[PDB]
Amino acid sequence: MMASLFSVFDPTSSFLSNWLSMLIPLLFMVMSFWLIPSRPQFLAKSVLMGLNREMSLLMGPASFGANILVIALFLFILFNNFIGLFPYIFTATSHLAVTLSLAVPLWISFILYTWIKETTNALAHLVPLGTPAPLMPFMVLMEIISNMIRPITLSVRLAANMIAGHLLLTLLGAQGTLENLYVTSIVVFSQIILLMLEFSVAIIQSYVFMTLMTLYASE
Amino acid sequence: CNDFGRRPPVFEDATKVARAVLESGMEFTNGKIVYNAFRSVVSFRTTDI
Amino acid sequence: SGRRGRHVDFGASVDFEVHMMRRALKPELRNEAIKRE
Amino acid sequence: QMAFTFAAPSQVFYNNANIRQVDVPSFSGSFGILPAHVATLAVLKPGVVTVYQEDGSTKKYFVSSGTVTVNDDSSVQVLAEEAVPVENLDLQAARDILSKAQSDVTSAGADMLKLAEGQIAVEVGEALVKAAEG
Amino acid sequence: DIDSAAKFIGAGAATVGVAGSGAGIGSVFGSLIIGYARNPSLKQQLFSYAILGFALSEAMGLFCLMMAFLLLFAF
Amino acid sequence: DIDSAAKFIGAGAATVGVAGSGAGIGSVFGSLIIGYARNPSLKQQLFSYAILGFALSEAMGLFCLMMAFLLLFAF
Amino acid sequence: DIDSAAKFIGAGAATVGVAGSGAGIGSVFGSLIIGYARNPSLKQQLFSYAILGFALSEAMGLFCLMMAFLLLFAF
Amino acid sequence: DIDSAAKFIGAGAATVGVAGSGAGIGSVFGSLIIGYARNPSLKQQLFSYAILGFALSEAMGLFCLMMAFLLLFAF
Amino acid sequence: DIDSAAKFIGAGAATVGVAGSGAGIGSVFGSLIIGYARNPSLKQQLFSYAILGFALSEAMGLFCLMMAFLLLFAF
Amino acid sequence: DIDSAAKFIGAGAATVGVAGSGAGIGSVFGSLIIGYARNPSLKQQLFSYAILGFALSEAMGLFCLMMAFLLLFAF
Amino acid sequence: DIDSAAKFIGAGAATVGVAGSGAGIGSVFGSLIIGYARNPSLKQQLFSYAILGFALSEAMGLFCLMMAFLLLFAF
Amino acid sequence: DIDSAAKFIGAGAATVGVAGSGAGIGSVFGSLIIGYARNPSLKQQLFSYAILGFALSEAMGLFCLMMAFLLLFAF
């Protein structure tokens, strides 16, 4: 009930810029040496092989070997949401260029490959199936607008979750005092509930974006 | 039940017994049916359903 | 329903349902299927 | 993988045969069955059970009553009172019984039980009219 | 100048009422999913009704667009 | 100028009330799909009752849109 | 002249309340379809309670539209 | 008259709570159609429960109607 | 007067949360009717969950009504 | 004050989403009654899903109450 | 000064309709839950129709969000 | 001042778009209880589809929340 603060998204606060905040997931990659794997390698391998099995129902021939790109997109999203919630790290996903890289090049990849391969089916995706003549043209124009700006909202969605998540945490932290045990315990317990929500949504947001890209690479 | 056996058993006679169990209103939770199973030509077994 | 509301057993409903089915078996199978008792 | 046990007191149709789809008219709604269906059971009503085997063959089996049970082991047990293929049925006979049923309804009067029997035969006659004319 | 500002509030207020078309379209396509879960052999009739359900709910949504357009440049 | 301005804000607010008709239409044609997916032989009276729901939901939607014009050109 | 201005905005915002009538009517006549699909032998009794649902929802909607007129000519 | 003007806008924005009465009455009485389509033997027990639901749902509509008058002739 | 106008507009805009409690009451009491038509012998615990549904849906309705007074008298 | 009025108007329009919590709670707790109408011996396991549904729906309630505080003391 | 200022008022009220898009998407996917407890064998075909239901539901929210961007800086 | 004042009003109007996300969340999680009640052996797969429903439900409300954050201290 005291105050608030913002602006945790400055890339050049120091001469060692915040581009190193994107080079942090390279550390967490499980580099493998031995034949029999270690504990975290087997955990990571079991998770990824689990996701590959689940996505195998939705792969299709046009994404015959593009599942590596989808899984790499999943791990990149997860390590840019999980690492964005740790305290003294600037919110990388808040910067739109990360979200620009997330949605725009892959959407252009999928829409141009669809247009070159199946041009009539791509235009038929802009119409609801079995649409009569008087119901045709307004559905076509709106779905043209829909399919043009749908990945832009995907980029907004990935940004907005971590922006709203980090704004909520900074709000709860700034409205607490160290000296007051009652306020500190309330603030800490409120953030723990909020972090459990924010950790859960971050994993689920990465899971749905893998599912959406697997569906849209199948076609 | 009586006057039975000369005619072949058909579903209507089964429904007559089925309606007899219902409309009598007698209380029953579990139960069984006693019949001669058809094991073979010369062997028949008495089981319960 | 109407059958339970009129207090008619489903077995009695079955016999009425099958008798009406059998009466629509005009060409050859009415006498062969109905063997009476 | 869907075991089918469509039998009847008169005839026997299928015995543990793999069927792609069977649509059943039940009192809980004229729903359909696919392999590994919902564990449930329901009561048959006058209508057209259809069989769509692994080859996609369409067969229509009108029944007059019965039972439908789907167990958790993908085992289908449909038992019906008198299951016949609908090709050996007459729409003219269906309307004749239907008109006879309408006469029973009109002549029932204070006989509420006979009124119910007229309603029951009306449902059977209307079911066969759609069955034979379709 | 005030008419310019009042048109902007009203045009924004006119686009409040497209949420109902958003919810109803999900309702008619949601009940398509349940209705096609059971009774799968009526796919053609069920999905044609889902199109009719969408064609009328978005028609109310385009009626919001018509009044939003009416309160943005027409009046 | 004030009167024309406030009528523009009011007509924008009156156009929200068509949202519920947008949700209602999407509701009634949703349950028509379920109602036709079970016992499809009653399509004649089902669609007769379903169009009764549509002719009442959208009528209340046009009731809001009629009142939107009354606060745009009548009053 | 702001009192007439406030009435125009208020009556516009009051008229949103007919949306709840719109969604309710589309709900009850939606569930009427499901009700008619399951045991249609009580058609007239079910339709009677459906009209009672309509006469208790749209009445509230036109109760709100009455308050819109009161906000233009009594308040 | 600005303070009275704000009260007219405030009451007008308070009568949107009737939309809560519309959806609740529509959903409850629609569900009554489904609940009376099957098991009509308890048609007096279910009807009594739905009228209880209708009364509580319509009470929220009267709560906002009171709040509209509470910003009208109470302060 | 200007800050008094803010309180009255803020209260009139914060009293729309009771519409959601009106819908939430209708959903639980609506589902109670369906849930009691099927297996009516579980009446006592069904009524308890319905009251539990009402005791959270209506209570979160008073969450906004508390904020209504927080924008009316307290702040 | 003008900016104090902007805070209050935003805060009143920040209490809108409390209606969404009431609808989300009423949907979950109502659907629990139907889900408990079958399997009365499955009380505790299904109760966990409903409280999960209640917690997430109420989390959206405090999510909207977040902007209520931000427009009351922060911005 | 009030031109772009009231454009920001309209833009906030224009992006309301994404809420109903969220309600619509939950309606489709919630009905997929009920539609998958029965008939798991139609997982792919039900999901593809549910995605089309989701796509048309999210298209409405983007339809409102594009209208919000139309009034933000697109003039 | 007045430009910033209308930025706060539009931010409040953008907070409207979170209620429907709470509605879609309550619809998925309510139907999850029904989905687990019917054939509880599919608990893990149905939970995955409902969680997928929650992924898109709150995200539609986050679009308006980001729009609220854009008009709070970003525009």
Tab-separated table of C-alpha atoms in Angstrom, chain E residues 34, chain F residues 31 34 38, chain G residues 27-28 30-35 38 46, chain H residues 26-40 42-43 45-51 53, chain I residues 25-43 46-47 50, chain J residues 27 29-38, chain K residues 34, chain L residues 34 38:
chain	number	residue	atom	x	y	z
E	34	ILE	CA	-19.772	-32.716	-27.271
F	31	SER	CA	-27.500	-26.635	-27.588
F	34	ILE	CA	-26.449	-31.296	-28.832
F	38	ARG	CA	-29.364	-36.972	-29.759
G	27	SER	CA	-29.707	-20.139	-22.654
G	28	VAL	CA	-33.245	-21.234	-21.790
G	30	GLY	CA	-30.962	-23.649	-25.851
G	31	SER	CA	-31.724	-25.938	-22.924
G	32	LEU	CA	-35.265	-26.273	-24.271
G	33	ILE	CA	-33.730	-28.018	-27.292
G	34	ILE	CA	-31.858	-30.440	-25.029
G	35	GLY	CA	-35.011	-30.870	-22.961
G	38	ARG	CA	-34.681	-36.071	-24.109
G	46	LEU	CA	-41.567	-28.297	-21.074
H	26	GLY	CA	-32.085	-17.816	-18.001
H	27	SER	CA	-29.560	-20.433	-16.923
H	28	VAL	CA	-31.571	-21.726	-13.955
H	29	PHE	CA	-34.885	-21.981	-15.785
H	30	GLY	CA	-33.152	-23.493	-18.791
H	31	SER	CA	-31.585	-26.105	-16.522
H	32	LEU	CA	-35.050	-26.734	-15.082
H	33	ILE	CA	-36.137	-27.787	-18.579
H	34	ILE	CA	-33.387	-30.414	-18.624
H	35	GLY	CA	-34.120	-31.412	-15.029
H	36	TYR	CA	-37.829	-31.800	-15.792
H	37	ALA	CA	-37.300	-33.511	-19.159
H	38	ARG	CA	-36.104	-36.554	-17.211
H	39	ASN	CA	-37.401	-37.585	-13.770
H	40	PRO	CA	-40.705	-35.645	-13.793
H	42	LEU	CA	-39.882	-34.913	-8.480
H	43	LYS	CA	-41.228	-31.958	-10.482
H	45	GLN	CA	-38.977	-30.696	-5.447
H	46	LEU	CA	-36.918	-29.449	-8.399
H	47	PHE	CA	-39.292	-26.544	-9.078
H	48	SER	CA	-39.015	-25.411	-5.456
H	49	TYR	CA	-35.218	-25.525	-5.662
H	50	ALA	CA	-35.169	-23.550	-8.919
H	51	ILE	CA	-37.456	-20.834	-7.527
H	53	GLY	CA	-32.246	-20.201	-7.228
I	25	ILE	CA	-25.506	-18.026	-8.577
I	26	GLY	CA	-27.443	-19.013	-11.687
I	27	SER	CA	-24.789	-21.528	-12.700
I	28	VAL	CA	-24.671	-23.344	-9.349
I	29	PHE	CA	-28.419	-23.291	-8.747
I	30	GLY	CA	-28.886	-24.237	-12.382
I	31	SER	CA	-26.531	-27.190	-12.047
I	32	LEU	CA	-28.233	-28.135	-8.778
I	33	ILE	CA	-31.499	-28.742	-10.641
I	34	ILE	CA	-29.815	-31.068	-13.135
I	35	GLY	CA	-27.720	-32.719	-10.433
I	36	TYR	CA	-30.811	-33.418	-8.343
I	37	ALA	CA	-32.891	-34.833	-11.202
I	38	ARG	CA	-30.200	-37.513	-11.538
I	39	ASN	CA	-29.811	-39.490	-8.272
I	40	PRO	CA	-32.131	-37.497	-5.960
I	41	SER	CA	-31.158	-39.628	-2.938
I	42	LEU	CA	-27.996	-37.534	-2.382
I	43	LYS	CA	-30.055	-34.463	-1.456
I	46	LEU	CA	-25.886	-31.907	-2.870
I	47	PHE	CA	-27.590	-29.025	-1.062
I	50	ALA	CA	-24.877	-25.811	-3.588
J	27	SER	CA	-19.262	-22.452	-13.223
J	29	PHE	CA	-18.820	-25.080	-8.197
J	30	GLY	CA	-21.973	-25.745	-10.194
J	31	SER	CA	-20.226	-28.305	-12.381
J	32	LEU	CA	-18.920	-29.929	-9.202
J	33	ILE	CA	-22.538	-30.604	-8.208
J	34	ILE	CA	-23.192	-32.456	-11.468
J	35	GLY	CA	-19.846	-34.249	-11.203
J	36	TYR	CA	-20.749	-35.261	-7.642
J	37	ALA	CA	-24.350	-36.181	-8.528
J	38	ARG	CA	-22.689	-39.274	-9.959
K	34	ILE	CA	-16.586	-33.688	-21.456
L	34	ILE	CA	-17.343	-33.494	-15.008
L	38	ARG	CA	-17.105	-39.536	-16.193
